[PDB]
Design a protein around this ligand. Structure first.
Ligand SMILES: NCc1ccc(Cl)cc1
Ligand SMILES: NCc1ccc(Cl)cc1
Lengths: 122, 356, 358, 109
C-alpha cells in the first residue's frame, strides 16, 4: 500500500525511469520538471486523454492500470527522459501506443512532460 | 558566384533526408540534407513542431507536414503541409489541414503520397483516427477518410496510381482507392492477417511492387498481396531457427525493415534476450532474409540502428541510430558497410533517399 | 483512483528562487527561463521565451517579465516583438505588450532589459541597427517612448537612488543620463565628461552597481567609476586591478556579466584569467578576484570554475556564478567567498542568472 | 582549413560557419538569405603578414545550422562600438531574423 503513493517515496526513486509505475513512459517525468507524479508543473495543462499502461508493482505483487496523461502548453522540460515500453503497442491499438503526442487534443499541443496516474487494478 | 539564391551543390542522386525531431527542443525540428557518397551536409529545411517530411515522387519538391501556433505555446493552431523546392530548399506553398494531423514519431507511414504523385496521404488523430487526402495540384485538403477509424498508417500500392492500405485493429488491412478528385471511390477490407493480442506486427512494411511483408513482436512474418482486386493475407512464418529461438532473438526498432525488390531480400533489425517491452531496442544485428526461401542469408552487426531505408537502383541500405547514418552496399546477400555519417541529427528516427 | 491536476504554484518560497536564462543557442527559437531553488538545486519550473528571450523579475517580486520575437511562421511571416508579463508563482502568461520590431537580439547581458528603480517602467535596448532605448509603461501595458537621444550608445544602467533615471554607455567614452517624467517620456538628460578611452582602454558594459555610483572594468584590467550622487555624473579612473606580481602573468578580466558589487562592504567581484591578450575578453574565469573599491586593493582570490557570468544578492550575502551550464552558489559574507554547492545542468547555453528579489 | 575556427579569416566569428552548412565561406546555404548589414573584424593574414577587414554577413531565415560553432573575439568590442560587436544577431534587420550561419568575406586591407 505504501508503494501505491509516490508522494511518500524517496524523490530519487520516483524520478527514476525504473520506478514501477513508469513502465510505458515515453517522455520527461513531470516529477523532475517542477511537478509531481500526479500534478503538472506550474503553467502546464493536463491532457484529458492519454495512453494507458499495465505495470507490475513488485512491492505488492499486483498489476495496475496506469494512465500516462501529459502536461502540455510549455516547451520540452528536457529532464528525466524515459523510453520504457512494457505492454506498449502500435497505433492500431491507439490508446496503448506511446509514439504519439498525448497533448494532441489540448488547447496548446506543445509537449512539456508526462505523469503516471494510478487508475486501479488491472 | 552570387551570395544567395544557390541550389544544392550535389546532384539529386546523391541526396538523403534525415528528419531530425530534435525531441529535446521539439519546436525546432528540421530536415537535414546530406550527400551519402561523402557525408557532406548540403542544407536543411525547418519544420517547426514535430515535422514530417517526404520527397515528391518526381524528385522536384520536398513536402513537409507540421504544426504552428500564433505564439508557439499559445494562440491559434495551424496544421499545414508545405511544398518546398527540392533544389533551392525554399518555401513555395502552404496547404491548410484540419487541426488533427498526427503528432508523433516519424514512421514512414504517417506521411506518404500516391504512386501517381497526385495526392498526399497523411494520418490524422483527434484522437479518433482518419486519413487525410491532399490534392497537390489544387493545394487543397479534399477528403477525410473516416472509414479508416480504428486503423493506423498509410501503405501506398506501387502497382496502382491512387490506392493505399492501412492496418486496422481487427488484424486486417483496409484498402482505399481514390477517384480522380481524391474522394474515396471504393474500398475493401481483407481477412485477418495477424492476431492483434497474440502476435502484433510492427507497422513498417517491407514493400514490394504488389506485395508487402510485416514482422511481428515475436519474430514472425506476415504478408499482404495486392496484385488482385482484393488483398490476400498470410503468415506467420518465423524469422528464427532453433538456436535463434533459444537466445530469444526478436525484432526491434522503428522503421525497422526493408526490401530489396530485385532479390527478394528482407532486412530486419534484431536483438537477443527479447521479452515484453524490448520492441524498440536498438539493433544488435541486421538480419537479411530471403523471403522466397524463408531462410536467413546473412547477419551483421547492427551498430545500434533503429531505422533504415533502401534504394533499389543503387542497391543501398541506410541505417540510423538516432544521430549517425550508416551506408551499406546490399548488392550481395551479405551487406558491406561503406561509411558512417557522424552527427547527422540529434534525434532522428527516419532517413530517406531522394528518388531517382 | 488518482486524477492529474494543474493550476499549481511554484513549490518553493520566492526567497529560494533563481532564474537561469537558457538561450539554447543551438536551437535559439526555443530559448527559455529555468527556475531553480538555489538552496538545494531543485528544478521548479520554466517559462518559454521563443527566439532569443530575455528575462527579468518585477522589482516587487510578483511578476516575471520576458522579451522575445515571434513570427507568424517562425522562419517567415510577420514579426512581433513583445514584452510578456507572467505570474511569478503560477508561471502563467498574463499579458503581451507590443514593441516596435527592433528589440535587441543578442546575448543576455543584464543591461539590455531592465527597469527603473521604482518598477514603473521597463527599459530595453533597441537596434534597427541604429540604437535607441525603448520605454514600456508597466501600469498602462504600453510602449510609450523611444529614446533616440541614446543613438550611438549601448545598454541600460538604472540609478538605484532615483525612481526613473538610468544611464547608458556611449561611443564617445562617456555616459548619457536619462531622467524620465511620470509619463515615461524624457524629462531631462545630461552627458558626462569622457570616462574611458574607447580605443585605448575599452570597458566591459557590465556595471558593478552601488546605490549612487557604478564601477566598470576594462579589457586591460583597469577600473573606472561613474558617481551619480548628484544630477551630473562625475567620472573617474583608471585604477588598476593588478599589483606587480599580477602583471607578470598578464592577468585581465574576462566574461559576460562578469562583475558584481556587494554594496554593504564595497567589495567588487570580477572574473579574471591569466595570459591576457587581444581576443581573450570573453574567456572563462581562472579566478574570481574580490576588490575593496575604497582601498583600491584586492582582498581575496579564489578559483573561478570556468565561470562567465555572475549575480549578487545583497540581503543574503550571496554570489551565483555560471559557466554556461552549471550554477555555483557562494557565501560572500566574508572577504573570501565560500562555495556552498553547484547545480549541474541548469542550462544548455546560459550567460545570465538572477535572484528573485526579497 | 576553412571549416576550422582557427582559419585566419574567422577571427571575429560568433556563430556557425556557413561552409559547414551547405554554403561556402562567401555564400549562403540554399534557402538562407544574406544580411545587408554586419559586424566587421580585423584579422591577421599569416601568409603575407598583413591585416584585413573581414565582413561577417550572416545568412538568415532558417533555424540554427548547428555545425562548426566558433566564438573568436580578435579585436571585437562591445555594443558602444556597434559594428565591431559580435554578441548581437546581425540578421536583426532581415525580413526574417532567425540566425542560420555566418560568412567571412574579405573586404580589403
Ligand atoms: N509520448 C511522447 C511524444 C511526444 C511528442 C511526439 Cl510528437 C511524439 C511522442
Ligand atoms: N552573432 C551570433 C548571434 C546570433 C544571434 C544572437 Cl541573439 C546572438 C549572437
Amino acid at each position: 500500500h505504501i508503494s501505491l503513493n509516490p508522494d511518500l517515496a524517496n524523490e530519487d526513486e520516483v524520478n527514476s525511469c525504473d520506478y514501477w509505475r513508469h513502465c510505458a513512459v515515453d517522455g520527461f517525468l513531470c516529477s523532475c520538471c517542477g511537478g509531481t507524479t500526479t500534478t503538472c508543473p506550474p503553467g502546464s495543462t493536463p491532457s484529458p486523454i492519454s495512453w494507458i499502461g499495465t505495470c507490475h508493482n513488485p512491492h505488492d505483487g499486483k498489476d495496475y492500470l496506469i494512465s500516462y496523461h501529459d502536461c502540455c502548453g510549455k516547451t520540452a522540460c528536457g529532464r528525466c527522459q524515459c523510453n520504457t515500453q512494457t505492454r506498449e503497442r502500435p497505433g492500431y491499438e491507439f490508446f496503448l501506443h506511446n509514439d504519439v503526442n498525448w497533448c494532441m487534443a489540448n488547447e496548446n499541443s506543445t509537449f512539456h512532460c508526462t505523469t503516471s496516474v494510478l487508475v486501479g487494478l488491472a | 558566384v552570387l551570395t544567395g539564391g544557390h541550389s544544392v551543390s550535389a546532384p539529386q542522386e546523391n541526396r538523403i533526408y534525415v528528419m531530425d525531431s530534435v525531441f529535446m527542443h521539439l519546436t525546432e525540428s528540421r530536415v537535414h540534407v546530406y550527400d551519402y557518397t561523402n557525408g557532406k551536409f548540403l542544407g536543411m529545411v525547418p519544420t517547426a513542431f514535430n515535422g514530417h517530411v517526404q520527397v515528391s515522387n518526381d524528385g522536384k519538391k520536398i513536402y513537409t507536414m507540421t504544426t504552428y501556433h500564433e505564439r508557439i505555446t499559445r494562440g491559434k493552431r495551424s496544421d499545414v503541409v508545405e511544398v518546398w523546392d527540392a533544389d533551392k530548399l525554399t518555401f513555395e506553398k502552404e496547404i491548410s489541414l484540419p487541426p488533427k494531423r498526427v503528432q508523433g514519431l516519424n514512421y514512414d507511414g504517417l506521411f506518404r503520397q500516391t504512386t501517381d504523385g497526385k495526392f498526399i496521404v497523411l494520418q490524422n488523430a483527434s484522437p479518433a483516427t482518419s486519413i487525410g487526402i491532399v490534392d497537390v495540384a489544387k493545394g487543397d485538403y479534399v477528403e477525410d477518410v473516416t472509414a479508416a477509424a480504428g486503423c493506423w498508417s498509410v501503405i501506398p500500392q506501387p502497382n496502382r496510381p491512387r490506392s493505399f492500405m492501412t492496418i486496422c485493429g481487427d488484424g486486417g488491412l483496409l484498402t482505399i482507392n481514390l477517384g480522380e478528385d481524391g474522394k474515396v471511390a471504393s474500398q475493401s477490407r481483407s481477412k485477418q492477417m495477424f492476431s492483434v493480442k497474440d502476435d502484433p506486427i510492427f507497422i513498417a512494411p517491407a514493400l514490394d511492387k504488389d506485395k508487402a511483408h510485416f514482422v511481428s513482436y515475436y519474430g514472425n512474418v506476415y504478408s499482404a498481396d495486392f496484385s488482385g482486386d482484393e488483398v490476400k493475407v498470410d503468415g506467420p512464418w518465423s524469422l528464427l531457427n532453433d538456436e535463434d529461438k533459444a537466445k530469444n532473438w526478436v525484432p526491434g526498432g522503428y522503421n525497422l525493415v526493408g526490401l530489396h525488390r530485385a532479390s527478394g531480400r528482407m532486412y530486419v533489425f534484431m536483438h537477443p534476450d527479447g521479452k515484453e517491452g524490448t520492441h524498440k531496442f536498438p539493433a544488435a544485428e541486421i538480419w537479411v532474409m530471403d523471403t522466397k526461401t524463408k531462410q536467413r542469408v546473412a547477419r551483421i552487426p547492427g551498430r545500434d540502428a533503429l531505422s533504415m531505408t533502401i534504394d533499389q537502383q543503387r542497391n543501398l541500405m541506410l541505417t540510423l541510430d538516432g544521430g549517425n547514418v550508416n551506408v551499406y552496399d546490399i548488392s550481395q546477400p551479405e551487406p558491406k558497410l561503406l561509411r558512417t555519417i557522424e552527427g547527422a541529427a540529434e534525434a532522428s528516427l527516419q532517413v530517406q533517399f531522394h528518388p531517382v
